[PDB]
């Protein structure tokens, strides 16, 4: 139940902190009033996924009523929705987009004096050695060399941050999923890549110097190292939350088993079912925490 | 007038090639018919920047008719929008290396399937300037990493690979000559620093995490300037790397919105910024206009 803190002393010295991509500012908005009661922050790539998540949990939590306005301006690159102690924010695609969102979200939570906060990324992913539809709760977000580190250059120098997710939080999410009994859920590592076509070893980019055999040997090697899925935003998320001492999780459903090739052969109705599994799990986590 | 080629033997061997993010397919769309005559490919961050571009060039090339519209040709994720008038194709790539890399893979395949030849690729955008008056345009000689090296590093199969990020030298000179012809705004050729990350990657002081000071930042930016860098943005490196890999002639033309050094405040009024926004578009349109003369 600790207050959210920053790793940037400059913020406290600023007369006004503008959150450029949310169209929010400390001089135009009252952060404690707007967000002080936030305890749960769920993030994911698309505005439509995150609006559906907020409607879903509104219903599940008994806040629903027979609406959910974007807190950001329609013109902003991120969307944001709130019901009760739950905040939902989209982060767009790729490491650079999520990082910007996270910088501004973390400052928001700080300005609002939030406490005892939990952050969880939900989304889809390519599985390795699991049946399609399996949910992975990420233990470590790992780089394409299987290391639990995320690197960035600050002023021309490399800085490396650990990408472990919160350990007690992964166990709790595992117990939550057991309680549901609706779909397979495993604890595994998640490989996060900067590039989709060559970075995930696909064979259908404009540039490919390797073969299906090469790709397999790499995927099998990843599996042997504890990796069960692949996506493109987990590493920064884990690294930044770790830096700021925030309790964070990643919960992604697999859409295919890449060991069987890159074809997504599940029928539309099945996929629509798979897509909502991260959201069901997170809603049960939130439900249980509130009870 | 060479045919656009791929560096992936798998594509030709496919019965069907789906561009997943554009939501376009060789089996559902007639690529040659749609794009076969494209000679100029301009790319940039947002659909709005790229729609304004296609409108501008349609008018300059004489294609414009009141009041028809240039509809979006992409059918997939809204990050990527696509407009086409005559030999000019305009495509948005979204923000950051991962988003633009995806676009470039699918766009290069598109040009291949359409059997385009003699193509020129040019990225337009805004950027942070170093040592230049706001509103200056920088034609990028080399895209350069945060250590000032003309390299783009990518991980393949767990293996680090490095690719050169020089842009086409005769192209930068032609663009420089085109800008002198306009006589509208200051244009310099220099290097462009591409950063993966915004808040820490560009050494800003206003993120959630910052270990350095304004003195540290300014010393870094002065070093960048000494190394030939005049602007900073977030996509130039992969663009140059991927074009070089497929042997495509490419350029990057960005306007600066501020002189960084002076700090990170953007002091230009709204009116002035709106004008700065159009500068890359104007230079590129004049370039295409002259090429087609």
């Amino acid at each position: 139940n600790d207050l959210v803190q920053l790793c940037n002393p400059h913020i406290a010295a600023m007369k006004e902190d503008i959150l450029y991509h949310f169209s929010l500012s400390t001089s135009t908005h009252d952060f404690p009033a707007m967000f002080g009661d936030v305890k749960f922050v769920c993030v994911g790539g698309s505005p439509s996924r995150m609006k559906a998540f907020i409607k879903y949990v509104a219903m599940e939590l008994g806040f629903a009523h027979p609406d959910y306005p974007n807190i950001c301006e329609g013109t902003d690159r991120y969307a944001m929705f709130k019901v009760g102690p739950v905040l939902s924010v989209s982060h767009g695609m790729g490491v650079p987009s999520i990082a910007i969102m996270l910088h501004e979200l973390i400052k928001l939570l700080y300005h609002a004096h939030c406490s005892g906060v939990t952050l969880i990324r939900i989304g889809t992913s390519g599985g390795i050695g699991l049946e399609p539809g399996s949910v992975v709760i990420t233990r470590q977000a790992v780089d394409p060399c299987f290391k639990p580190e995320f690197e960035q250059i600050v002023l021309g120098k490399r800085e490396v941050r650990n990408t472990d997710l919160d350990e007690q939080l992964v166990q709790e999410l595992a117990r939550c999923s057991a309680e549901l009994g609706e779909f397979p859920t495993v604890v595994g590592n998640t490989m996060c890549t900067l590039d989709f076509y060559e970075g995930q070893g696909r064979l259908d980019g404009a540039l490919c110097s390797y073969t299906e055999k090469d790709k397999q040997d790499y995927l099998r090697a990843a599996y042997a190292a504890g990796i069960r899925n692949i996506e493109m935003e987990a590493s920064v998320f884990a690294a930044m939350c770790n830096a700021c001492g925030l309790r964070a999780a990643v919960v992604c459903v697999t859409l295919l088993n890449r060991l069987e090739g890159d074809q997504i052969s599940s029928p539309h109705d099945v996929l629509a079912e798979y897509q909502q599994r991260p959201q069901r799990l997170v809603g049960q986590f939130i439900k249980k925490r509130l009870m």
Side-chain angles (χ1 to χ4, degrees), chain A residues 93-96 121 124-127 144 191-210 215 218-219 229-233 255-256 258 261-264:
Chain A
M93 94 89 33
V95 156
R121 171 174 145 63
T124 58
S125 63
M191 189 179 82
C192 170
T193 70
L194 269 189
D195 184 63
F196 175 77
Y197 283 105
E198 290 180 287
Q200 306 194 356
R202 302 181 57 90
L203 304 177
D204 53 356
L207 301 47
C208 176
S209 64
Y210 46 84
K215 171 180 71 185
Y218 174 61
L219 295 182
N229 64 332
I230 301 169
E231 53 85 73
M232 302 190 63
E233 294 91 24
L255 298 185
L256 74 163
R258 295 170 57 71
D262 283 329
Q263 180 172 334
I264 303 188

Side-chain angles (χ1 to χ4, degrees), chain A residues 129-152:
Chain A
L130 298 181
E131 294 306 289
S134 299
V135 170
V136 177
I137 302 164
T138 302
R139 182 177 42 236
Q140 302 174 310
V142 121
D143 79 0
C145 304
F146 317 155
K147 304 195 254 72
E149 301 166 17
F150 172 74
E151 162 212 291
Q152 64 185 3

